[PDB]
């Protein structure tokens, strides 16, 4: 019940036809071109594969998700952020952020081809990054693909205590304050779960997707700017 993607066509098979185990395995092949990738997110699909393997496309059931408002924040994190040593920006250094993610340990799945593919979406205005700075040094951040009022988180990275939590916390506030509705996490992991991510039915997620992709945030919401300083 899988499928080999057409090298000339950008079409995808329906997500409900994906495998149960591995969860969401939907197709393989094709390419990571701007249009293809973009099409995959509109349909609740995303590429995920290790170096050496051919492109693998997924749409898991259930789906990992994070309600911005339901973001969990311990009391020591609140004390920390009130006196934060960090500065947070948006779309200041997409290239550095994704490279920071691809440099962790699964950062090994963020292959050169993947870095190049998402960089294209960034240049084209679809992928965005949140940077966390400690003085002059980039110490964390995250990036994803905007889909209207729905944001699909791709990865995060941390080089200093609470750096990635500061990226998400600040991002959520900004996002919530301007109409953001949901953050897609694809698959629930340990870190993502401690932040408040939960699981909902694949069709529920696809319903939200179709509804939120039409939604709109302020026209200049993603222009590069400082989001948190003093």
């Amino acid at each position: 019940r899988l499928v080999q993607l057409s090298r000339h066509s950008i079409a995808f098979p329906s997500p409900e036809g994906a495998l149960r185990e591995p969860n969401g395995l939907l197709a393989l092949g094709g390419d990571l071109s701007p249009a293809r990738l973009l099409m995959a997110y509109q349909r609740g699909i995303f590429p995920w594969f290790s170096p050496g393997d051919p492109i693998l496309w997924w749409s898991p059931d259930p789906r990992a998700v994070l309600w911005p408002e339901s973001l969990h924040i311990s009391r020591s994190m609140k004390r920390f952020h009130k006196r934060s040593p960090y500065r947070v920006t948006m779309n200041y250094a997409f290239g550095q952020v994704i490279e920071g993610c691809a440099s962790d340990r699964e950062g090994t799945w963020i292959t050169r081809g993947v870095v190049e593919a998402y960089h294209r979406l960034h240049e084209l205005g679809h992928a965005h990054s949140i940077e966390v700075w400690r003085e002059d040094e980039l110490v964390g951040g995250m990036y994803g693909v905007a889909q209207g009022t729905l944001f699909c988180g791709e990865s995060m990275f941390s080089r200093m205590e609470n750096a990635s939590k500061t990226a998400l916390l600040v991002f959520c506030e900004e996002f919530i304050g301007h109409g953001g509705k949901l953050i897609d996490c694809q698959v629930l992991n340990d870190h993502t779960a401690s932040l408040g991510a939960c699981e909902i039915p694949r069709r529920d997620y696809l319903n939200y997707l179709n509804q939120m992709r039409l939604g709109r945030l302020p026209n200049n919401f993603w222009v590069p700017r400082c989001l948190f300083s003093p």
């Binding site: 699964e106 799945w109 995250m142 994803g144 990865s155 996490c185 694809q186 698959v187 870190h191 993502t192």
Partner: peptide, 5 residues
């Protein structure tokens, strides 16, 4: 964020 597990 899938690239965290």
């Amino acid at each position: 964020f899938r690239y965290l597990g």
